[model samples]
Target: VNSFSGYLKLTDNVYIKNADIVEEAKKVKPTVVVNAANVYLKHGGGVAGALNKATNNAMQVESDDYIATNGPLKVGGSCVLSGHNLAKHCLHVVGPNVNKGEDIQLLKSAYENFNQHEVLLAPLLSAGIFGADPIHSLRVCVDTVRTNVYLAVFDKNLYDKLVSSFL
Candidate 1:
């Protein structure tokens, strides 16, 4: 259904639409990242709503400062694996833990809407864990995001078509 919607576009199939933009923006983005000593969460009005409360609570604790301190720091590995340090901004779009068609649509809508907002989108995170084949999830992501992609799979040669598709 999601891909077909793109297919039905009056002009280019990939032409971004305002309706898509507004819908995606409403559900995605403007995410709140919570930084705590032991807890790291991304709150996008979806998973991890706790962080939203944490974000607001911190503002009140900090005398309601509009500008939070931006520290100069460094980290290693993808920000998600690095733990609480890179919890500054929402770099990833998270959906439900399970894979559902609606979730995929939400992901696509997010990619479209976020792009429409002129936000530079990074590689989004998803659950390839459930997929029996390594690149199955990647293919779904391609369909969802509607683009060629480079995905870091755990093992090479496990998914031929995924790499070949990109090629």
Candidate 2:
């Protein structure tokens, strides 16, 4: 898949990708894939939709079942469960809105709150429909990356733009 993609490191622990996160996360043992989920953790569109397609919507069921028991997942908070396919664990995080300091702090908190693990693969959190600048999420990840980090970029243009941001 990476034949048409590329990879680069902004830091020793941080790596960026032009690849499907679901495929990459499954490459290792019990990998944890972070979802840019909404407050209700619905698997309707965006990154969640890609993951849902990968799992054939079992991720949505798990998410529904989890919320049914635990109530809505708040912004900056996360909950994890088996993703059933491709990814071993799914870390569902509710990213906040963009253009506010409060939302930025919450966004940073959401990334930092990922539980300790060997490998963590994630998308540009809050940067899509949430309207965050991709650099915001990129910097958060670079500053806080603690494990082997794989930050997925779905588009070639974005991957190219951010890969040189450190320069």
Candidate 3:
């Protein structure tokens, strides 16, 4: 069955969605895929973890190119890497760690700082493993990114809810 059930156009090129991010990444053939990471570039869980495992931890190895931002990367802040198995490049940005009850604003900042790309796929930053409000995170991502945006979502109900709200 299709895990995703809905889609919403936030702008000409941005979309809110509920779908397998990995599957979408493959189909979209995005120039860049975004990974919301912590400071150390360890992709242990959440979207970062999944993408890291898929790409064989390419971000961790390539993180040497960027100066450690130390705290959550300012929203366009990222350590970019050529993906090992997915997109041509991956952009690793620090996002709010909701487990710490981090200010949700950090999530917005991450999106605001997202780099440019022809097509980009992103998870709802801080919404999953970090536990930020998914709807809020989705809005931040849609509002912040400049290029074509594809959001990866796994919840069918949430997808319906967001889609309905848009209508």
The candidate that wins on lDDT is: 2
Off by over 4 Å in 3: 1-7, 64-76
For model 3, how does the per-residue alpha-carbon lDDT over 57-92 read when each residue is reduced to its tens digit?
Answer: 665666644445443345335667776677777877
How far off is residue 84 in model 1, in Å? 8.2
Candidate 3, residue 1: lDDT: 21
Candidate 2: tens digits of C-alpha lDDT, residues 125-146: 8877677888878888777657
| lDDT: worst 10-residue window of model 3 | 67-76
Question: Model 1, range 1-167, lDDT digits (tens) per residue?
Answer: 22212211222222222222212322343232211111123233322233334344442233223113432112110122111221324333333233333343333333332332222213223333322233344344445544322222323344334445541
Separately for all candidates shown, the number of backbone clashes (residues 3 or more apart, or on different chains) is 0, 0, 5
| C-alpha root-mean-square deviation, candidate 2 | 3.5
Deviating ranges (above 4 Å) for candidate 1: 1-90, 99-102, 113-124, 130-150, 165-167
lDDT score of residue 75 within candidate 2? 86
TM-score of each: 0.31, 0.87, 0.79
Candidate topping TM-score: 2
Report residue 47 deviation for candidate 2 (angstroms).
0.2
Model 1: what TM-score? 0.31
Q: What C-alpha lDDT does candidate 1 achieve relative to the native structure?
A: 0.29
Q: Any idea what lDDT model 3 has?
A: 0.69
